């Protein structure tokens, strides 16, 4: 039932209790909800959110670096096959030279 | 209800209690809110915020270094393809030499 | 100690970009060497044709 028992309902309950016991409730710290501005968040949760964001971003960066190095190895194997083909062509050229 | 039960309301409540029991409240440590300056934050939370900022900045630095090395590997593969093309051109040059 | 730790954190953060720029300069130097090798290839072609 807390999702419905917001702030204004609790304030009205406490105010009714006071009226039953002490009438003037505005005389002190307690403020009429009409002029109660919301609290100003602190830098702690802000920097905590920033740290969590940086951590998840580093996680995604590592995840992408994995596939990056995978593609790098694939391209390196392709280049090695290319070098093998070039060496075969050079072998054929040397055969032509020897036969001439 | 705490967001409305600020400092001044609590001070008024305590002052009313005192008046009911002890009249002169200003005689001692308790100060009239009019001349109560806010507390001076300590270096502890400051250095903690600084450490959190440095940590998140290092996280972002690693995240960027990931893509940096990825682009480096991509450029290296491109350079390898360039070297393969150069070797093919040199093979054609050697073929021209042998045929001449 | 807290100051030294945060300073080391900033030092690592800067070293990251430092090594990044180093790799960039190394790739640039590799492209330069490739251009030099192409020029030497053209020189060898001139030699062979002469």
Residue numbers in the entry:
A (entry chain J), B (entry chain K): 549 to 648
C (entry chain J): 599 to 648
Lines from the paper:
The tail is attached to one of the vertices of the prolate capsid, where the dodecamer of portal proteins (gp6) replaces a pentamer of capsid proteins. Furthermore, the wing domain mediates the interactions of the portal complex with the capsid. Because of the mismatch of the fivefold symmetry of the capsid and twelvefold symmetry of the portal, we characterized their interactions using an asymmetric reconstruction of the neck region of the SU10 virion, which reached a resolution of 4.6 Å. Residues 8–44 from the wing domain form a curved α-helix that lines the inner face of the capsid. Additional interactions between the portal and capsid are mediated by the wing domain’s stem loop. The stem domain connects the wing and clip domains and spans across the capsid shell. The clip domain of the portal complex reaches out from the capsid and enables the attachment of the adaptor proteins. An embracing loop of adaptor protein is wedged between the clip domains of a pair of neighboring portal proteins and binds to stem loops of two additional portal proteins positioned clockwise when looking at the portal complex from outside the capsid.
Escherichia coli phage SU10 belongs to the genus Kuravirus from the class Caudoviricetes of phages with short non-contractile tails. Here we show that the virion of SU10 has a prolate head, containing genome and ejection proteins, and a tail, which is formed of portal, adaptor, nozzle, and tail needle proteins and decorated with long and short fibers. In contrast to other short-tailed phages, the tails of Kuraviruses elongate upon cell attachment. After binding to the host, SU10 tail, nozzle proteins, and short fibers re-arrange to form a nozzle that extends the tail.
